[PDB]
Design a protein around this nucleic acid. Structure first.
Ligand SMILES: [Mg+2]
Ligand SMILES: [Mg+2]
Ligand SMILES: [Mg+2]
Ligand SMILES: [Mg+2]
Ligand SMILES: [Mg+2]
Lengths: 205, 142, 59, 94, 37, 171
RNA sequence: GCGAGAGCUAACUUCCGUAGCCGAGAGGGAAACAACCCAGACCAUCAGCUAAGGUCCCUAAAUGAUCGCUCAGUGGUUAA
RNA sequence: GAUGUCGGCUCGUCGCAUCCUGGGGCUGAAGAAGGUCCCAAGGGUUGGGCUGUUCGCCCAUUAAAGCGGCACGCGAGCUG
RNA sequence: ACCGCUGAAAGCAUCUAAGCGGGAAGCCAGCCCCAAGAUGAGUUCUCCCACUGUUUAUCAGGUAAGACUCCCGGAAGACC
């Protein structure tokens, strides 16, 4: 349901009481609302929020049209949120609250093409008792004349990372509104400067 | 020497699946699609009336709509891609119980596939008759 | 191809190849079979004739 | 059909098996089986009444067709020419 | 419960029942509780 | 075969369709049956006559009467079973209507009567499921007689007063 | 297949007797399929009657008629 | 006119006649702990010493340290 | 699997043939991720707009909205 948009910023040490706790400072800048999809307009409920600002000289005509339909001010990023609402815009103020468990979802860093050891763990082989299949290189891929082929999915080398990931249940250590800053314990996905989306715990204990 | 073809036609009949046993209704729908009483009654291409189907949701089975009637569908490389659902379980998508029980009785090659197109099922009643703006000779079962 | 059409007309009245055919048969009189389909495809006026002709030699 | 027509029409030149009576003009008469001389649908026997008169137009040698047979592994390959003769007959009958 | 292939009475009580497709045995005594399936 | 239908006063039947409707002092009831299953009131009392006879038909026969006969004793006098809480610290109390167990579980079992049934408790060791529809009542005290089945060694839990449960006997 | 031995009255097992087909045999049927079943291809034909097998739809033809049987999906993998 | 052979390693995947977890009937089931049969394969099923071993024996643990199938799975993947 | 309520055929008995309820790490939904080449190619919001070319060059040609090319880089990447 509820949720906001933001830029990851870095992690750092912070003591809450006498326990040093690592956190990820996320800037959940205010988020405008640029379109309310209704189960009677677009067939399903949801809100269109926006994020970084974009210079107007860079805005497509078609987009202006959109953004103007709600006198907003071109953002550069728009995203939806099912079953969400209110009036005006969306800022963490009153949205999230210190202590709330949340789910941060960003785009994982990108590892490019990675072998099986690093993409699936595997194990490759030896390093001395004979070879050319030193450490990496997968083993065998199938079996034989039966299923005389390979399974759809057999883990293999392939572009690793650069995916959508969602780390669940994160305590919100501290919220400094009026800076739209927010500290979540643990570690959120992707690179600093990267987009991140925080929300109510999709399904927490 | 034997007769050629037409086109300028496309009878738009409308069956009703209410209470009728899926099979019988099937055969019929299947038949009028491939070529019922048939125009030039010719193979090469289909002249088989387009068929609209209402209700569906209330077709009929006999001793099993729980037992036996298990529609199977085996996904990607069969790494446990064995999916089975109760026909009653087709309270999710009745429109398929028919759809995919009639495509069965239609030819299986190029044209045949071109043939499921004319078949057009709806699990409702009135609301269906909306997705219907041409003729509609409601030629019920028997 | 012939037998297929001959009864998609046969059944167009209330007969069906099986029956229909034995009928014209019941009337040695009738004896086309060859072109019968065509008659049933082009001349409905005619085809009916032969149709009813059989029922009228049937029951 | 199986030799010597029948049915209705309007008199066209059609080809059938050889008719024996060579020459031309050979006024030919075919019984009849069905027809509509005036949309008058007429079935067997009740049609025998009416009849058809057609004249032998010409005699022909069909289009050369090759009869080839074949079985594998056992060698066996057979090539042989062929083409069936006929008779052209201009319809005109009752 | 006893799932034997050759089910049959065991004392003047065993009420050999036939529930859903199965041939069963219900007797006051439980160790008598039989069942082909 | 079965036939004798004691359909006293208060009641009111209505073989209107397959809906063999009913109404009495306890409240108007309803109890479907087959159609081909014949039955209507002939004079004073009642009767469910049957088409064929043997099985398929006679079964449904030995079915309907008893069924209706229940609608009778129902609206007429209403049902109400009585349960027994038994064994140390076993006990029922109550919340509005909701029966409340307390039979040795780390926490307490809270029961709730279905729309048209009521619980009752005399001594917090004796239970009472009173109702209309013979079934439900049975079909609910059942759920009580499950929160705790009697043990084969001290027959604790719930039971049917003159409940016959012998002890296997241990050490 | 039928009659025997050999073999665990096992084997698309082995060895003989005897009939048929494949081998040197196309065609229809038995989903597919040497030998099973119906049948032995001189060539042509948008002609006709049948065999075995079949006549809900995928393919040709009665979702035929009458009196029954089983509710098992038996039908559409065996026994004490 | 070549279908590479034992074991290991790597990679798996499937059956169930279930090793462990889950649900049950009976027990000669007091409770705790078991036995046994029924249902159930989701996931899991350790590390070493000896031997090429597969197996098995043993150490030390474990909820458990299942049994089989896939050309006794996998050498155009390695070992040898 | 197993346990039950109402209950005949067997005026009793019966988890059953009418009917109804509970009930597993399993099935379906749920969680995270992909997803209309879901060729049955879906929905929504916004932008550009109705040009030119004589039966001799029958259609492409100026263009809008928009984008690509190219340059400089990147927490994106084998190349794209
Ligand atoms: Mg390594
Ligand atoms: Mg035997
Ligand atoms: Mg257990
Ligand atoms: Mg290999
Ligand atoms: Mg580059």
């Amino acid at each position: 349901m509820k949720g906001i948009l933001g830029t990851k910023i870095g992690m750092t040490q912070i003591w809450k009481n006498d326990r040093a706790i690592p956190v990820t400072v996320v800037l959940a800048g205010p988020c405008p609302i640029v379109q309310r999809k209704t189960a009677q307009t677009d067939g399903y409920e949801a809100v269109q929020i926006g994020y970084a600002p974009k210079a107007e000289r860079k805005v497509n005509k078609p987009m202006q049209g959109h953004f103007a339909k709600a006198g907003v001010a071109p953002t550069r990023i728009l995203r939806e949120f099912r079953g969400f609402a209110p009036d005006g815009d969306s800022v963490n103020v009153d949205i999230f609250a210190e202590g709330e468990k949340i789910d941060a979802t960003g785009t994982s860093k990108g590892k490019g093409t990675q072998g099986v050891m690093k993409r699936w763990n595997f194990a490759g082989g030896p390093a001395s008792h004979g070879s050319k299949k030193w450490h990496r290189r997968p083993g065998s891929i199938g079996q034989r004349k039966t299923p005389g082929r390979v399974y759809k999915g057999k883990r293999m080398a392939g572009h690793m990372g650069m995916e959508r990931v969602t780390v669940q249940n994160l305590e919100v250590v501290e919220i400094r509104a009026g800076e739209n800053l927010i500290l979540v314990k643990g570690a959120i996905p992707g690179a600093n400067g990267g987009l991140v989306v925080l929300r109510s715990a999709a399904k927490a204990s | 020497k034997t007769y050629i073809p037409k086109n300028d036609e496309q009878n738009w009949v409308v069956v009703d699946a209410s209470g009728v046993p899926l099979g019988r209704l099937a055969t019929l729908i299947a038949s009028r699609i491939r070529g019922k009483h048939r125009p030039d009654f010719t193979p090469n291409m289909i002249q088989g009336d387009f068929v609209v189907v209402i209700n569906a949701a209330q077709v009929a089975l006999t001793g099993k709509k729980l037992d036996d009637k298990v529609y199977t569908r085996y996904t990607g490389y069969q790494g446990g891609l064995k999916t089975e659902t109760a026909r009653e379980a087709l309270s999710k998508h009745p429109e398929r119980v028919i759809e995919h029980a009639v495509f069965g009785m239609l030819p299986k090659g190029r044209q045949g596939r071109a043939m499921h197109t004319r078949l057009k099922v709806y699990a409702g009643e009135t609301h269906p008759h909306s997705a219907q703006k041409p003729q509609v000779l409601k030629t019920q079962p028997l | 191809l012939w037998i297929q059409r001959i009864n998609a007309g046969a059944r167009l009245h209330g007969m069906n190849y099986s029956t229909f055919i034995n009928g014209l048969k019941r009337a040695n009189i009738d004896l086309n079979r060859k072109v019968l389909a065509d008659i049933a495809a082009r001349e409905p006026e005619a085809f009916k004739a032969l149709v009813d002709a059989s029922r009228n030699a049937r029951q | 059909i199986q030799t010597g027509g029948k049915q209705y029409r309007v008199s066209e030149g059609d080809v059938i098996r050889v008719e024996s009576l060579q020459g031309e003009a050979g006024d030919k008469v075919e019984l009849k089986a069905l027809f509509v001389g005036g949309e008058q649908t007429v079935f067997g026997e009740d049609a025998g009444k009416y009849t058809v008169q057609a004249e032998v137009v010409e005699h022909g040698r069909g289009k050369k067709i090759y009869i080839r047979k074949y079985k594998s592994g056992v060698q066996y390959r057979r090539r042989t020419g062929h083409r069936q003769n006929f008779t052209a007959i201009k319809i005109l009958g009752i | 419960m006893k799932v034997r292939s050759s089910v049959k009475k065991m004392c003047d009580n065993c009420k050999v029942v036939r529930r859903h497709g199965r041939v069963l045995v219900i007797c006051s005594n439980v160790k008598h509780k039989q069942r082909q399936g | 075969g079965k036939q004798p239908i004691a359909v006293p006063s208060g009641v009111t039947v209505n073989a209107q369709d397959g809906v063999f409707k009913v109404k009495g002092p306890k409240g108007e009831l309803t109890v479907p049956y087959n159609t081909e299953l014949t039955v209507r009131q002939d004079g004073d009392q009642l009767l469910v006559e049957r088409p064929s006879d043997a099985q398929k038909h006679r079964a449904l026969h030995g079915l309907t009467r008893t069924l209706v006969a229940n609608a009778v004793k129902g609206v007429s006098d209403g049902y109400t079973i009585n349960l027994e809480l038994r064994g140390v610290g076993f006990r029922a109390k109550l919340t509005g209507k909701a029966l409340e167990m307390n039979i040795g579980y780390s926490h307490p079992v809270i029961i709730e009567p279905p729309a048209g049934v009521t619980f009752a408790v005399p001594e917090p060791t004796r239970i009472d499921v009173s109702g209309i529809d013979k079934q439900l009542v049975g079909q609910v005290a059942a759920n009580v007689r499950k929160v705790r089945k009697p043990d084969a060694y001290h027959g604790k839990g719930v039971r049917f007063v003159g409940e016959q449960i012998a002890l296997k006997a241990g050490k």
